[PDB]
Amino acid sequence: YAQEKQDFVQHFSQIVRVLTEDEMGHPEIGDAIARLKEVLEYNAIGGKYNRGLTVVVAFRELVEPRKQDADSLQRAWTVGWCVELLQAFFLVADDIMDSSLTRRGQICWYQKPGVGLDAINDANLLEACIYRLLKLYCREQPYYLNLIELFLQSSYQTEIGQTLDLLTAPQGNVDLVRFTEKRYKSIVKYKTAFYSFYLPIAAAMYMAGIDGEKEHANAKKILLEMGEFFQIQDDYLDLFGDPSVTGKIGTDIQDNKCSWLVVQCLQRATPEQYQILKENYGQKEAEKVARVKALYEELDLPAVFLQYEEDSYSHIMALIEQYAAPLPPAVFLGLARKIYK
Amino acid sequence: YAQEKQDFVQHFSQIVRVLTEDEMGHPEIGDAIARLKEVLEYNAIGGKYNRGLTVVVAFRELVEPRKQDADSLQRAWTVGWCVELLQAFFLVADDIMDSSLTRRGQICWYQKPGVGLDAINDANLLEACIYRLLKLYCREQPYYLNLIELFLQSSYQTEIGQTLDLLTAPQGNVDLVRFTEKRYKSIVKYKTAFYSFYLPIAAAMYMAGIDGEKEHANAKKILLEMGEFFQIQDDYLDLFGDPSVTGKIGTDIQDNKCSWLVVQCLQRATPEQYQILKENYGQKEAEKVARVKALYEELDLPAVFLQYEEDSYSHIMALIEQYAAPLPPAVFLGLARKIYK
Numbered sequence: 001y002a003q004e005k006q007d008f009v010q011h012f013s014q015i016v017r018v019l020t021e022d023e024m025g026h027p028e029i030g031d032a033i034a035r036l037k038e039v040l041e042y043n044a045i046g047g048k049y050n051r052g053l054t055v056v057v058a059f060r061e062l063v064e065p066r067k068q069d070a071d072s073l074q075r076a077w078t079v080g081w082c083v084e085l086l087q088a089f090f091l092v093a094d095d096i097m098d099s100s101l102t103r104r105g106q107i108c109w110y111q112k113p114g115v116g117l118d119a120i121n122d123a124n125l126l127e128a129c130i131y132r133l134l135k136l137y138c139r140e141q142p143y144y145l146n147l148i149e150l151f152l153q154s155s156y157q158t159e160i161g162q163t164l165d166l167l168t169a170p171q172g173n174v175d176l177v178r179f180t181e182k183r184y185k186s187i188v189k190y191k192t193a194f195y196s197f198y199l200p201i202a203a204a205m206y207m208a209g210i211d212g213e214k215e216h217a218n219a220k221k222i223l224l225e226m227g228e229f230f231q232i233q234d235d236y237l238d239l240f241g242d243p244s245v246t247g248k249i250g251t252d253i254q255d256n257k258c259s260w261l262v263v264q265c266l267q268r269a270t271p272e273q274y275q276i277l278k279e280n281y282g283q284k285e286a287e288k289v290a291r292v293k294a295l296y297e298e299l300d301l302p303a304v305f306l307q308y309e310e311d312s313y314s315h316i317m318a319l320i321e322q323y324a325a326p327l328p329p330a331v332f333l334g335l336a337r338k339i340y341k
Numbered sequence: 342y343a344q345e346k347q348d349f350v351q352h353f354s355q356i357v358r359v360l361t362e363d364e365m366g367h368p369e370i371g372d373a374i375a376r377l378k379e380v381l382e383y384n385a386i387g388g389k390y391n392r393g394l395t396v397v398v399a400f401r402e403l404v405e406p407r408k409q410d411a412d413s414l415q416r417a418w419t420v421g422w423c424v425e426l427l428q429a430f431f432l433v434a435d436d437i438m439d440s441s442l443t444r445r446g447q448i449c450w451y452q453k454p455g456v457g458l459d460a461i462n463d464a465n466l467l468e469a470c471i472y473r474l475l476k477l478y479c480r481e482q483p484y485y486l487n488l489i490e491l492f493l494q495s496s497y498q499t500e501i502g503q504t505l506d507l508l509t510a511p512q513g514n515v516d517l518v519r520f521t522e523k524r525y526k527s528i529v530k531y532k533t534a535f536y537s538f539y540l541p542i543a544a545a546m547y548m549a550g551i552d553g554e555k556e557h558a559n560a561k562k563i564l565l566e567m568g569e570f571f572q573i574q575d576d577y578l579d580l581f582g583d584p585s586v587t588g589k590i591g592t593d594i595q596d597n598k599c600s601w602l603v604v605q606c607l608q609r610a611t612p613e614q615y616q617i618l619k620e621n622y623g624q625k626e627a628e629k630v631a632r633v634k635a636l637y638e639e640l641d642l643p644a645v646f647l648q649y650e651e652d653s654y655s656h657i658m659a660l661i662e663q664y665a666a667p668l669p670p671a672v673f674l675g676l677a678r679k680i681y682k
């Protein structure tokens with residue numbers, strides 16, 4: 001897998017070439033295109049590329065190898081990068097909205113000297129680049145319109161999710177009462193699971209000619225569920241994670257996030273435990289956050305997670321058995337294996 | 342005309358109804374949809390509606406009246422409102438980027454208590470609403486894909502323009518040297534003229550079945566030129582405008598805008614006039630701005646505008662004669678009449 005991830009990053013350079021070149025018939029806009037190039041190179045590079053890579057892996061497993069000519073695979077590479085650009089667009093914008101300082105250990109684009117709120121237009125350009133690529137590489141393909149609509153629906157759903165999330169954790173408002181499990185699962189589904197798990201596989205499906213509404217509804221049932229586990233596990237690792245094997249240290253408590261952990265804690269917790277979480281959930285002081293962390297362990301949450309994970313794992317297998325056909329189960333199982341590890 | 346503008350605003354209420362109702366099968370997202378409703382009603386209402394209205398006017402003049410059934414006209418109403426939503430999206434975002442205080446005399450959405458930078462996601466939702474409407478009302482139409490692509494290209498071109506503009510007038514940097522006429526016309530074309538004049542007419546064209554590349558290239562030649570005059574005249578009225586008949590007072594000098602006025606001034610101006618504009622172009626003090634205003638009149642700019650306008654007017658007529666056919670010239674002349682007045 002981590003060999004294919006090399007050929008994927010490899011293609012970025014062509015993606016950039018093809019995008020930063022309508023200045024050919026239009027030298028007028030050269031300065032703008034140069035900024036676009038810089039936006040792409042700062043923001044589309046430096047993550048794990050797993051979503052876009054999933055398009056390519058899925059594509060191979062879905063389409064005949066004798067159908068996999070140089071051009072087909074080229075479009076697979078481009079659509080996966082389209083997923084990554086959709087992500088880069090969300091992240092640049094999300095970083096501004098919640099005033100983050102760093103992303104991928106690195107300085108947030110909007111925080112760089114001389115960028116600031118201009119990053120809002122930068123973010124929008126990242127979104128537009130998706131549709132320029134699709135038209136450049138897929139205009140003639142029969143699934144063309146399908147992919148445009150899929151990308152657009154994924155944008156809209158993520159944005160609804162971001163809204164839900166922003167209503168839910170108004171930065172400057174610690175109201176633990178709106179952190180229900182039902183609102184949690186609703187936020188994970190729209191803001192994270194649709195574009196992170198359904199979109200990549202759906203894209204490869206359409207590219208492989210599988211446009212059937214039932215097949216997508218079935219692939220969606222599996223992927224949304226995998227997405228829900230993914231975020232739940234991420235909320236768990238944020239805190240109890242091993243900061244060495246993860247990649248950074250977590251701050252969900254220090255940000256009043258509607259984390260899975262805190263939904264669980266509140267779902268339990270005597271009314272004294274209620275009002276001591278309602279006391280430390282937000283501040284930057286390591287004494288106050290480690291207090292809640294403690295209250296979590298005291299409620300055995302890490303245990304109820306480890307139970308949840310095993311239950312979640314058997315549920316997803318039951319889902320693959322039931323709803324994978326006639327797609328090769330490998331397409332879902334390859335994913336499950338990498339998320340649940 | 343100002344009777345049709347009534348039936349257009351009238352339709353907004355249905356637009357909102359149809360948009361704020363996927364919560365039907367999805368009560369989970371109710372709070373998000375309510376925020377969307379509030380975003381639409383604050384931001385899509387309160388301007389002059391001329392761009393969207395142009396779609397409808399153009400549609401009637403392009404398609405047979407016996408082809409104009411209740412459903413056709415319904416889609417015309419929706420696509421025009423789609424233009425308005427594309428605009429509301431740009432404006433909400435542009436207001437944040439240059440820290441404006443008011444828009445349409447009213448408080449900028451992002452400046453309202455409790456909104457702030459969340460308006461970035463709000464802006465994106467406005468954009469997404471375009472494509473939800475197009476799919477809801479035009480999915481089955483043969484020009485469906487054409488309109489998606491037209492809206493997407495209009496987004497991308499406006500965004501390139503906004504980039505060009507932001508590179509050009511770095512708020513915090515008064516370098517009068519990058520205010521060339523060529524950079525000016527390049528900024529007006531991408532950021533303003535494509536979506537303001539080409540998009541509305543192009544949309545009606547596609548809806549009326551006129552998808553021919555040459556016809557659009559010809560309609561584009563006229564409309565881009567009309568757009569250039571529109572912005573140039575707007576830059577002129579910003580300052581020398583009569584604040585009573587305009588609608589508000591101008592600030593282009595107080596903002597270091599790459600205005601037509603200042604491009605002209607610099608294109609003239611002895612090197613003492615160079616360095617006194619290079620002295621007052623930006624500050625808020627009414628003494629320093631009225632200084633430049635004076636320097637403008639001293640260079641007779643208002644005269645060279647009045648010459649420019651007449652020349653521009655005959656040029657556009659020559660363009661309509663040449664490039665309108667086989668479209669009814671009324672479609673372009675109705676526009677010209679309202680802009681040049």
Ligand SMILES: O=C(O)Cn1c(C(=O)O)cc2ccc3ccccc3c21
Pocket residue numbers: 048049050051054196197335338339
């Ligand atoms: O990259 C991540 O954010 C998490 N992740 C990891 C990881 O390195 O932890 C592996 C892996 C594999 C496939 C994925 C598909 C969609 C979304 C995330 C994925 C993913």
Ligand SMILES: O=C(O)Cn1c(C(=O)O)cc2ccc3ccccc3c21
Pocket residue numbers: 389390391392395537538676679680
């Ligand atoms: O609304 C405006 O910003 C300027 N304007 C006016 C005005 O009331 O000044 C009339 C009018 C008519 C058609 C238009 C088409 C596209 C863009 C702007 C238009 C427009």
